[PDB]
Ligand binder design. Structure first.
Ligand SMILES: *[C@@]1(O[C@H]2[C@H](O)[C@@H](O)[C@H](O)O[C@@H]2CO)O[C@H](CO[C@H]2OC[C@@H](O)[C@H](O)[C@H]2O)[C@@H](O[C@@H]2O[C@H](CO[C@H]3OC[C@@H](O)[C@H](O)[C@H]3O)[C@@H](O[C@@H]3O[C@H](CO[C@H]4OC[C@@H](O)[C@H](O)[C@H]4O)[C@@H](O)[C@H](O)[C@H]3O)[C@H](O)[C@H]2O)[C@H](O)[C@H]1O
Ligand SMILES: [Ca+2]
Length: 166
């Protein structure tokens, strides 16, 4: 059982994402208002997909006030208080030098854990951490943050988010 839905983008038709809010089931891709140069989100069919046939590509053309202004959040993430989950995802970038934070938190924005400010290379890597649901929440979120200025001009690819009981 996986806590998150559509973790590998296989539920979504290929193409540029034109409905950030609802166009990728299991995810919210809304952009913060402080961003003035829009990013591009695209579900890509590709033979190097770590799983299945699709990945999500995020082209960062500019940043805003906080790195969370360019983001992909998995939701809902269905969990149980007390349980420790393993988070795993695959990521790479068009150019070495990209930076991503992989986070999990509640609908209050309190975080349970993160992998902070990770360097992303041109080759796929698994990024993994454990976290415990430490409050009473059963429906949480998994925000991925791309809006670091180091990413401007780059494209970050993600696939295979799986949040699983340890
Ligand atoms: C967390 O602290 C980090 C710290 O930032 C690091 O520097 C450090 O080393 O580690 C700690 C954790 O151990 O920071 C989170 C934000 O991180 C991102 O921005 C800051 C940057 O330094 C960092 O690199 C980057 O990853 C923060 O979560 C954010 O919380 C925002 C709300 O903040 C309040 O409530 C939670 C409290 O903890 C804070 O003190 C309060 O100010 C929240 O902002 C809201 O975002 C809305 C949009 O949301 C959607 O898009 C962004 C997605 O992240 C989100 O899932 C989507 O739903 C917007 O509409 C609101 O107006 C805005 O307030 C951010 O979404 C959330 O990511 C952690 O709380 C904090 O512990
Ligand atoms: Ca996939």
């Amino acid at each position: 059982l996986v806590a998150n839905i559509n973790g590998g983008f296989e539920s979504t038709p290929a193409g540029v994402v034109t409905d950030l809010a609802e166009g990728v089931e299991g995810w919210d891709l809304n952009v913060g208002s402080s961003v003035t140069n829009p990013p591009v989100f695209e579900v890509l069919e590709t033979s190097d997909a770590p799983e299945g046939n699709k990945v999500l590509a995020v082209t960062v053309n500019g940043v805003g006030n906080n790195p969370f202004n360019i983001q992909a959040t998995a939701l809902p993430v269905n969990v149980r208080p007390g349980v420790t989950y393993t988070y795993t995802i695959r990521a790479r970038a068009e150019q070495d030098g990209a930076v991503v934070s992989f986070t999990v938190g509640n609908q209050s924005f309190d975080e349970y854990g993160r992998l902070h400010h990770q360097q992303i290379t041109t080759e796929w890597q698994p990024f993994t951490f454990e976290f415990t649901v430490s409050d009473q929440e059963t429906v949480i979120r998994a925000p991925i943050h791309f809006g670091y200025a180091a990413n401007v001009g780059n494209t970050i690819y993600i696939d295979g988010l799986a949040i699983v009981d340890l």
